[PDB]
Amino acid sequence: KRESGRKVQSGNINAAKTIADIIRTCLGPKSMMKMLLDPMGGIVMTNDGNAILREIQVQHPAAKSMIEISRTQDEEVGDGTTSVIILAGEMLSVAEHFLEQQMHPTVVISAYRKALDDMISTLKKISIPVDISDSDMMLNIINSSITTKAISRWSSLACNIALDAVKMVQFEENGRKEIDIKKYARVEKIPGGIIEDSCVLRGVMINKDVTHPRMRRYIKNPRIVLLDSSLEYKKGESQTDIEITREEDFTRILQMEEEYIQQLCEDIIQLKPDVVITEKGISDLAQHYLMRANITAIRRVRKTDNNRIARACGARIVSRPEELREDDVGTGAGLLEIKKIGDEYFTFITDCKDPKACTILLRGASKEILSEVERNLQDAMQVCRNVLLDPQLVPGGGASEMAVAHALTEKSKAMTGVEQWPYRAVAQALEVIPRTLIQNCGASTIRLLTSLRAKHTQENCETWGVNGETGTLVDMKELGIWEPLAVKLQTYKTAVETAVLLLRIDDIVSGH
Amino acid sequence: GLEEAVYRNIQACKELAQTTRTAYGPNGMNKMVINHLEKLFVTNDAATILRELEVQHPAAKMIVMASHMQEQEVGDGTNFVLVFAGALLELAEELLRIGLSVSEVIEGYEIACRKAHEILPNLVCCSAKNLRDIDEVSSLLRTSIMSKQYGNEVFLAKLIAQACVSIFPDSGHFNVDNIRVCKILGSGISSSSVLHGMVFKKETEGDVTSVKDAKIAVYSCPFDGMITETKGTVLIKTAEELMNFSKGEENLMDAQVKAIADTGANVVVTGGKVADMALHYANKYNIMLVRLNSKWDLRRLCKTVGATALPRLTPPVLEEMGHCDSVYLSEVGDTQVVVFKHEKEDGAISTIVLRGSTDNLMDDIERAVDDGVNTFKVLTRDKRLVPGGGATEIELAKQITSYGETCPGLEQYAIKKFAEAFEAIPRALAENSGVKANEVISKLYAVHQEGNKNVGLDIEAEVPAVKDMLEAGILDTYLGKYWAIKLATNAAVTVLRVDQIIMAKP
Amino acid sequence: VARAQAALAVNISAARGLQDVLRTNLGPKGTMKMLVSGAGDIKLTKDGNVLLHEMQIQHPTASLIAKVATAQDDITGDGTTSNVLIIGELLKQADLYISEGLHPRIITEGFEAAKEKALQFLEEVKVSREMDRETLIDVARTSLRTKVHAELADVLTEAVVDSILAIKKQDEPIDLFMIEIMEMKHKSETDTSLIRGLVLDHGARHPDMKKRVEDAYILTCNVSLEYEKTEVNSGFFYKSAEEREKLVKAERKFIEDRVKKIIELKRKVCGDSDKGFVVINQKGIDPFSLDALSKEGIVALRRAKRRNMERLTLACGGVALNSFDDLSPDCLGHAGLVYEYTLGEEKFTFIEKCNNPRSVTLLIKGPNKHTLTQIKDAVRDGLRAVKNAIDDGCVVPGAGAVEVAMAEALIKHKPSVKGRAQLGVQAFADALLIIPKVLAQNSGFDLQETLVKIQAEHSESGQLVGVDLNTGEPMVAAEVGVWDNYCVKKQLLHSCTVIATNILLVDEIMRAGM
Ligand SMILES: Nc1ncnc2c1ncn2[C@@H]1O[C@H](COP(=O)(O)OP(=O)(O)OP(=O)(O)O)[C@@H](O)[C@H]1O
Ligand SMILES: Nc1ncnc2c1ncn2[C@@H]1O[C@H](COP(=O)(O)OP(=O)(O)OP(=O)(O)O)[C@@H](O)[C@H]1O
Ligand SMILES: Nc1ncnc2c1ncn2[C@@H]1O[C@H](COP(=O)(O)OP(=O)(O)OP(=O)(O)O)[C@@H](O)[C@H]1O
């Protein structure tokens, strides 16, 4: 029915601790697999933390809030979603300061938000600048995700795909250096060929096939036209329907259908175009007057894909087909081509410049190989985006966690007041990331973590990390286990933003 | 939820052996079986037992599927498979309790099976002399009709003898399909006889007693009111309009029987009922009309002369008619029957008519006649005869134990148990005759030790002794004993090879 | 509940449970299993692929191992139930060290170290013998004797050896689609043999037909000579039953003009004596058209298949024809003995002694229904084993000689990743010895008696030792002719390391909701 008091403060803790205990052992290169039982008897053995919680239904309101905050975090950056839910479950796991000390959560939130300012200040002190102009330094960053994959045979060519895609989308003139892979870098899959055939072209590709040979095959000066209106029968302002059942109604409708389309098609062929692009659909009779002028028919394109075509050639978006003019020209484009690739037709409006848009063309021997590269390249594109957003790396593999937790201990000696006791609990809760790395390797956890803290005290805090392969401690300056800064900045920010949301809930009530 | 997991595959076949062990022999007991259409039936044939008893265990279904292969290439000894191979799996359980592996019994059974196929030609005493006489044929058939219908073999051994001699000049064509059985209700088995050609129990409904026409057409539709293949809206209002349809029905049927007279066909077979006015039109144009309500009686005629059954109401089709030499009527046993005789042809069709007062009794004679034809259907091959009554079952068990004793190694255990499975068949014959089975086996081995061969069981309730099978006229088929030993050993090695059964979804 | 290591203890019991079931059907001395469909279908097999794919298990963990053997037959075609017996002992021997406090990731790191050393050991024991008739008999004998009750073990070897040897020439790759498998009833199980030509399901049904044609010209046809529709602009109109008799003669006249055209093409091209003519028309043939062709000596066949027509193109050489109006002699072929094989019920046309058919039909005969499906799954496993022997010229000794030799090579081997990977090569050496262990139980001998004798046999030379199925003595696999494939043993060690990893790499099981 309803629940209030201190029970929902402990009820939201065990709801987030249960989600964190599921995917706690799935961290690092030695991530353990998880077995999901379906009602139909199916079993998937995926060890990906985003794939486990997606196929698991939850009923708690706090546990439902735990999944969606990492799902939105997966859409922002393509790496670090498992470390968010682990850190959000460890910060709430020390319930001795929440219930036994009878402390209000406002003291904890004032201690948690004050510890959030020490997260950004410590990571900028252990950071290191990146020479992004050298292509050898960019290869040592993306290689952490290309290992144990089928794309690893072509790592020298697959790295050129993601690096050339992020640089074309990023605009240095705007200052803020925006990269959006979903719009300006729309990836499409083409069957046939091999992995070496996949390259990057500077344009937009249309997956509509060719149904008639009366089209433009090779045009050096493509005259493009964009239109928003439909090419069909004229409908009124009412919501009436079109039903053709009588022979008297079949003649009167088709005579009005032919006379309006021929009046529409006369306005576009007077400019002598090469390819027509309409927003809505194109009827079968509309192609009959269009094939006499040998124009390539392209239909069913979204409004978001329409502006990428207008920025590729420089055309004008015209609302109505009766209002065409001479300014709707595509002068400056490279070549128009309808050449088949593996018995599929594709339209090319590519150019020899950077018209603020691009696409990725994938090829492969089978359709399962097409799905393998697109899930590896999109994971690789978001990691290399964070490097070009800010050229700064952090020592990963638990080295940044012990460097941050060492700075919080010396800061807590000068932090007076009641809030110093939950302030020291965040330093021990940030140690769970190198704790599960030793437990997944199989060595003694407390024997290695105690010597890990002794190396972070006397020696330099930027070195002496954990290697998740052999099970011992190595120096992070020797191996390429470097993490991006913007990934680790949003990881500690979201883990605090989750802990500020679940601890502030003090009542769960119903109502529609 | 698991006790032995190898014993339950054998116990399901031991229940299949018990339903025919007490039903073995001329002194075997009958079985009150219930048909699936809720009909009471009394029989003792081993093939009719498995047809009605829907056995469900798939481990015992291998011996039933071996019985369907036992019915092929030989028509003798279906009860021999369910007794001997049942004794194989029962005696194999005494070896597995000691510690012997199941793969050791398998190779030991196939060794003694090939050894038993060499001793069986040594026991062939007599053979058929190919004289085509009724004295030579009925002397060997008296043993096969025994264990089916005991006491009435003196009338059955002479009737099937007169049928198979008429086919034996047709060399290489003798089969069980040439001798058909048609049951007629009557007094008893003493009034039964044998006729040539195709004989049906129903007489000619027409008034023609003899016709020499060759064209025979069969129509499965009854003689009734004609319905057009189109819609045909026929409406009547007054009594004069009803008489125009009544007289018009007889006038159209007058042209329907005239189309049979136009093609030169004077023999018509009707599956359904015949109207009285249509029966008058058949006798006007001298057409023989025979009513056959049975579908198996109609399907028999299509496979002999080629006359097919057409669903239309008398269509004049010259292509789908049959050909016969002489169709006439004969009065045999106070009942007129129709004979499809072959006068111009040499003839290879014979029909044994059986008489009786009970349909449950006459069906057991039909299984005894078809097993009598199948005894000589085997003897179209190489003629070799073996002594019956358990005479060959002791001598084969005497030589295999003598062979398995001299052979050293671990394989001597499965060879010794292959001989004792042959001892259950005289144990089945002694138990069903009310005699102590332990005394007859000792009396059989004492006379076979001195070399007195061809000694089997004396069929008598008061006499527990034995007698000679050569002087008694008891003789079995060597090919009937050849395929029975081979198929039962191949069936009993299949059950021992399968260890566990797992159900699977399609 | 139970958020602990209990998710591993339930998965190894499904592995131990699937090991104890499938251990009774390895080798020729093993037993068989029955597959009941619930409706009455009975099937007996020893193949572990059909024992896991067709057989349904209730346990969810054991359903994953059923998906392992489906991936085994796609690359090799052998060793599916031997895949289960290794991974059953691999997770059994892992439990001796996990209960002592060792992490399963450490044993996984030792299993990949034992996989690279055992794969390097397979390159030294392989024998690059020249592929001839005699060495392919021993390869076919190790594969076909495990699906046969030892009465067809001698007859079925020469049927599969001579079939693949007739299609292995000019260094061409072996294609299994060139081999046609046909089944016929009313015969014994030992009556199977090889057929040079093809087997058609329906033959000529006419009393005036020739029973055997020694030489003939085969015309490929695909035209329906039955009652067809109009090819000219007309319609089906009739006023009564007499108008239908005029219409059926005006419609069938489009058929018999083509039938007499085949006789005009027969008399033109080789119309003299010592000739022949067979029609291989796939579609239906008019029964009135069968009387018109059989009077001049033409055997007409009807009711064929689509795949059989393509094999008739390679056998005779005639191009597939679609219309009789443009009949031409380049669509004609040639064959040798064209006769009919008579059964108890049906008849089958046999077209052997072809010029260059490039297709061999295997004729498998059986008395029962389940007997036909057992040999059909045996000939597909036997032909794929010899195909692995021709394409991969190196072979390995059989009778478990590789697994005992790999147990000694893995003992004298130190790990180079850590010290705790010493149990990874220890448990991999003990789990590979389950194949001489399970071959003692199926043969009826003691398990530990022949294991000592197979391990004490060592010498200062190259010598392989295996188990004996008859006496239980040490037996050299090269001296008796027991050989396996190098490709099967390479995929055996590769697939066993992957599947035993994934069962060892789970810690929690959750109920999904799609
Ligand atoms: N050999 C190694 N030893 C120890 N740590 C390693 C090793 N290799 C990589 N790592 C670290 O492990 C981290 C990956 O941890 P984890 O699997 O929990 O996150 P993730 O699943 O990669 O995150 P996301 O879900 O965002 O991709 C990497 O950031 C890397 O720094
Ligand atoms: N009166 C008898 N004298 C001697 N032996 C007999 C006698 N009756 C039966 N037998 C023995 O019984 C065995 C065959 O008996 P039986 O007639 O019961 O088989 P069957 O009923 O013909 O088989 P099926 O069920 O196939 O018809 C033979 O071995 C035969 O020696
Ligand atoms: N005559 C023989 N004597 C001893 N061992 C043999 C003999 N023939 C085969 N083997 C052994 O049996 C093993 C194969 O067993 P089996 O044929 O029962 O399974 P399989 O059919 O190979 O399994 P899968 O169908 O999974 O490939 C081989 O490794 C071989 O060493």
Residue numbers in the entry:
A (entry chain G): 15 to 526
B (entry chain Q): 24 to 529
C (entry chain Z): 13 to 526
Original paper wording:
The eukaryotic chaperonin TRiC/CCT assists the folding of about 10% of cytosolic proteins through an ATP-driven conformational cycle, and the essential cytoskeleton protein tubulin is the obligate substrate of TRiC. TRiC is the most complex chaperone system identified to date. It has a double-ring structure, and each ring consists of eight paralogous subunits (denoted as CCT1–CCT8) arranged in a specific order. Each TRiC subunit consists of three domains: the substrate-recognition apical domain (A domain) and the ATP-binding equatorial domain (E domain) linked by the intermediate domain (I domain). Here, we present an ensemble of cryo-EM structures of endogenous human TRiC throughout its ATPase cycle, with three of them revealing endogenously engaged tubulin in different folding stages.
In the open-state map, obvious substrate density was observed in the cis-ring (denoted as TRiC-tubulin-S2). The overall TRiC conformation of the open-state S2 map was similar to that of the TRiC-NPP map. For the S2 map, the nucleotide density was fitted well by the ATP model, indicating that S2 was in the ATP-binding state. Indeed, the CCT2 subunit in the S2 map appeared less dynamic and better resolved than did that in the NPP-state S1 map, indicating that CCT2 may have been stabilized after it bound ATP. Accordingly, the substrate density in the S2 map, located above the central tail density of TRiC, appeared larger than that in the S1 map, with this difference attributed to ATP-binding-induced stabilization of TRiC. Notably, in TRiC-tubulin-S2, the substrate density was found to be closely associated with all three domains of CCT6/8 and to form loose contacts with the E domains of the other subunits. Compared with TRiC-tubulin-S1, it appeared that binding of ATP could drive tubulin to translocate from the E domains of all the subunits slightly up toward the A/I domains of TRiC, to converge more on the CCT6/8 subunits, while nevertheless remaining bound to all of the E domains. The subsequent binding of ATP to all the TRiC subunits could drive TRiC and associated tubulin to overcome the next barrier and to stabilize in the steadier TRiC-tubulin-S2 state, evidenced by the observation of the engaged tubulin density here becoming further stabilized and appearing larger.
